[PDB]
């Protein structure tokens, strides 16, 4: 269960790779605006990669919701988790990557007690 | 003495794979040789036959 929302539509599901990120290892896939005066990518020719522009902005009513319908919140300890006690249908706590296993089981205990959804409960747990 | 011989033998790996003829070969090759990059040959004589 989550706070009600419409369908989560993503106007561009594919990642915006950089122009020649495939041709060269030295060119990363991190997006970069092509600044060349004769860049067919910048001039927006037919048959080239799409570039980010504000038209692809997600719906404001849905912009930060995960597929479960929650906005993700990073928690590192029980104290951080309890800030979502009154916001349980609008937020789901995600446990930070560096929280140790014992502190993670403490977090899961408190989260289940408060009913807060935890995004990655499987975590470092190898019971 | 066996440990000493082992360490002496196990050290020479990097020098041998550089073909360093022992401990006495410390020939250094320059990064680039300016005589190899002659310039624009064909005017006058050139730097080599």
């Amino acid at each position: 269960a989550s706070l009600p929302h419409p369908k989560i539509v993503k106007k561009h599901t594919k990642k915006f790779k950089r122009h020649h990120s495939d041709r060269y290892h030295r060119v990363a896939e991190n997006w970069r605006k092509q600044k060349g005066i004769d860049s067919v990518v910048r001039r927006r020719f037919r048959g080239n990669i799409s570039q980010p522009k504000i038209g692809y902005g997600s719906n404001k009513k849905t912009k930060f919701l995960s597929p479960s319908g929650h906005k993700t919140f990073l928690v590192a300890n029980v104290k951080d988790l309890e800030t979502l006690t009154m916001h349980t249908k609008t937020y789901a706590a995600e446990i930070a990557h560096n929280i140790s296993a014992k502190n993670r089981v403490v977090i899961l205990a408190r989260a289940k007690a408060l009913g807060i959804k935890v995004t990655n409960p499987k975590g470092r747990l190898a019971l | 003495r066996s440990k000493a011989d082992r360490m002496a033998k196990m050290e020479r790996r990097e020098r041998n794979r550089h073909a360093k003829q022992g401990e006495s070969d410390r020939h250094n090759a320059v990064s680039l040789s300016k005589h190899l990059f002659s310039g624009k040959r064909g005017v006058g004589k050139t730097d080599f036959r």
Binding site: - | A4, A8, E23, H27
Partner: protein, 50 residues
């Protein structure tokens, strides 16, 4: 060369006495960083310039 002067012969004698690979017991000392004779010389392989 043959028919030397004494000064040259003394410098060559120093060079001969230095023509030594590392003594092994050096390698066994505590906190030893010396592993090879980095200042080793050879007659065909680097001249000593008198």
């Amino acid at each position: 060369a043959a028919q030397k002067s004494f000064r040259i012969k003394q410098k060559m004698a120093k060079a001969k006495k230095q023509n030594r690979p590392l003594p092994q017991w050096i390698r066994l000392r505590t906190n030893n960083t010396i592993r090879y004779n980095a200042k080793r010389r050879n007659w065909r392989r680097t001249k000593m310039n008198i």
